[PDB]
Amino acid sequence: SMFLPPPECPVFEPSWEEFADPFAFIHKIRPIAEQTGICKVRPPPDWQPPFACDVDKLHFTPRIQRLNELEAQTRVKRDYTLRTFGEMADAFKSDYFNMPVHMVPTELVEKEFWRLVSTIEEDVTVEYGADIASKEFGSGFPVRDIKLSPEEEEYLDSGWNLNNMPVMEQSVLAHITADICGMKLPWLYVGMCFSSFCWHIEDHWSYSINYLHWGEPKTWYGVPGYAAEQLENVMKKLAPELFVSQPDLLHQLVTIMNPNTLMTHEVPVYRTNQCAGEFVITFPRAYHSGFNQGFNFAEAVNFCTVDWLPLGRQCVEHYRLLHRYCVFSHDEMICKMASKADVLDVVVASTVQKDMAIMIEDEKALRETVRKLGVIDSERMDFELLPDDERQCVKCKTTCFMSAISCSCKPGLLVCLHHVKELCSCPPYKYKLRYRYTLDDLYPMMNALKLRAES
């Protein structure tokens, strides 16, 4: 009829044994879940992290949201307490349906959501909270600081405590010394009925994991990584405005779009209702979107496993082709890890070694190419010391680290080695190759990884 629900995504109910190590578990389910893009994880029944907060002392600045299909919204960006938001949220839903909120069936809210976003005559606006953990509003999980109860202490070091998972043994994102707070810290989300997250994939094609601490469910739609470009082609045809070049990371355009539209164009889509106490995990380059069924409170964080490393490299290549800004330098991350080879997990070391080999071979070829273009002069340069906005390629916006080209003619400007012709009109003999490492510096770094991997 008017909305046909996508098939359900995989749901996993790990034993305590399986659940004990999140990264082991995620690797285990990956062959299944990567075919659906998202999956849901129900922790063991007795894994129950305690949640406690004063609803009157937690306050936040609400974002306002129009609910129109295909309309452009910006991705990342009054004052409520948690109590006053809750009161607004419950009344909104109660008044919308002329029902008590627990009586409103989830399938009805879903059907109605897709009706109202598609109808021009309706102009429903809703509000929500989205912000990284701060002193005004912290994690929903226990954090060390305030005398904690024994039950809180039990969950302090859990891999599934989303504060840990970042610095947790296997997110290569942990090792990044660069400032990436917006991407590495957990985000807190206060939802209300119909408040929604537009179709998107994570920066650098990372994983994400979302925990619903309490409240009414969050409805999700997800698309497997292998269908990412199919989805973008559908979107581009129906809403080209979203695909124009953007001046920076703070201007990414995203939109609401009916999953049935994707399914009509043979893009595979899965759904789920995430309830309180459940996790949803999104996989690399898996498009996802959704909306809240009512007043709720969620927490989510990005992470990167060793499975992800090659995709991370591919993603930055993709950003270059699109002239998209990077959140961090992938090569910088790889070299930081190489410089710490002795303390790396051995499987991590082994996987980093493989990416590094590709990095070095690509870098070798690029340097040979720019030499043949007539760039002769060179000087070592510690790229990691420059603010990001001072080491982006003029042309493709990539964050430089391995090397770049400069010219005294254009002080402070840089191009990556793919865009030597785009820096200025001076002949290439006026240029300098700025490089972080010689090829001779690099091979021993990679050898340290091999030794650590015992290889």
Residue with smaller CB distance to Zn ion, 200 or 419: 419
The DSSP-derived string for 77-130 is ---EEHHHHHHHHHHHHHHHHTS-TTTS-HHHHHHHHHHHHH-TT---EEEEEE
Min dist. Cβ of residue 411 to Zn ion (A): 10
Find the Cα–Cα–Cα–Cα dihedral 362, 368, 371, 372, rounded to 10°: -120
128 is in an annotated binding site: yes
Residue 407 binding partner per list Zn ion, Mn ion, none, with a CB distance cut-off of 5 to 8 Å that depends on partner kind: Zn ion
Contact indicator for 269, 190 with CB cutoff of 8 Å: no
| Residue 31 Cβ vs Mn ion, minimum distance, rounded to whole Å | 22
DSSP category for residue 50: -
Q: Is 37 left (phi over 0), alpha (psi -120 to 50) or beta?
A: left
Q: Which residues pair with 11 in a beta bridge?
A: 40
Cβ at position 153, least distance to Zn ion in Å: 49
| 136 labelled binding-site residue | no
What tokens does 262 get?
């994707």
In the complex, the smallest distance separating the C-beta of residue 282 from Mn ion, rounded to whole angstroms, is 6
User: E strands of 398-438, at which residues?
Assistant: 403-407, 431-435
For residues 192 and 294, the answer to whether their CB atoms sit within 8 Å is yes
Q: How many angstroms separate the CA atoms of 76 and 218, rounded?
A: 19
- From residue 276, alpha-carbon distances to 20, 40, 244, 444 in Å are 20, 12, 38, 49
Point out which span in 183-191, 273-281, 337-345, 421-429 binds Zn ion (CB under 5 A): 421-429
**Would you count residue 407 as binding Zn ion (CB under 5 A)?**
yes
416 binds Zn ion (CB under 5 A): yes
Q: Please work out, in degrees rounded to the nearest 5, the angle formed at the alpha carbon of residue 396 by the alpha carbons of 390 and 402.
A: 60
Per the annotation, does 229 bind a ligand? Answer: no
Smaller CB distance to Zn ion: residue 174 or 394?
394
**192-211 binders of Mn ion (CB under 5 A):** 208
To Zn ion, the closest distance from the beta carbon of 320 in angstroms equals 6
Q: Which residue in the set 13, 56, 107, 122 belongs to the binding site for Mn ion (CB under 5 A)?
A: 122
Residue 417 Cβ vs Zn ion, minimum distance, rounded to whole Å: 8
Stretch that binds Zn ion, among 34-42, 156-164, 219-227, 395-403 (CB under 5 A): 395-403
Q: Which of 233, 218, 237, 230 is nearest to 268 (CA)?
A: 230
Q: Which is nearer to Zn ion, 288 or 313 (CB)?
A: 313
**Encoded amino acid at 280, one letter:** V
Task: Report, in Å, the least distance between residue 230 CB and Zn ion.
Answer: 27
Residue 286 C-alpha from the chain's centroid: 10
* Least spacing, CB of residue 394 vs Zn ion, in Å: 7
Of 122 and 157, CB closest to Mn ion: 122
Instruction: Give the total of residues touching Zn ion (CB under 5 A).
Output: 10
Which does residue 68 bind out of Mn ion, Zn ion, none, counting CB within 5 to 8 angstroms by kind?
Mn ion
Quote the tokens at residue 215. Answer: 């409240």
Query: How far is Cα 164 from Cα 158, in angstroms, rounded to an integer?
Result: 7
152 labelled binding-site residue: no
CA 413 from centre of chain: 29
Interface pick for Zn ion out of 99, 343, 426, 451 (rule CB under 5 A): 426
Binding mask 310-339 for Mn ion (x = CB under 5 A): ------------------------------
**200 annotated to bind ligand:** yes
From 15-23, 83-91, 245-253, 388-396, span contacting Zn ion (CB under 5 A): 388-396
| Residue 68 engages Mn ion in binding (rule: CB under 5 A) | yes
Please name the residues in contact with 373: beta carbons below 8 A apart, sequence gap of 6 or more: 420, 421, 428
Instruction: Considering the complex, state which of residue 198 and residue 316 has its C-beta at the smaller distance from Zn ion.
Output: 316
The first and second tokens of residue 142, run together, are 């226990």
Q: Which residue is nearest to Zn ion (CB)?
A: 409
CB of 354 to Zn ion, least distance (A): 25
* Residue 169, Ramachandran bin (φ over 0: left; ψ between -120 and 50: alpha; else beta): left
Partner whose binding site includes residue 122, from Zn ion, Mn ion, none (CB under 5 to 8 Å by kind): Mn ion
Tell me: is residue 202 an annotated ligand-binding position: yes
Q: Which does 426 bind (CB under 5 to 8 A by kind): Zn ion, Mn ion, none?
A: Zn ion
Known binder of ligand: residue 210? yes
Query: Which amino acids are annotated as binding site for Fe cation, given as ranges?
Result: 200, 202, 288
Q: Report the interface residues with Zn ion, using CB under 5 A.
A: 393, 395-396, 407, 409, 416, 418-419, 424, 426
Query: Which amino acids are annotated as binding site, given as ranges?
Result: 128, 200, 202, 208, 210, 218, 288
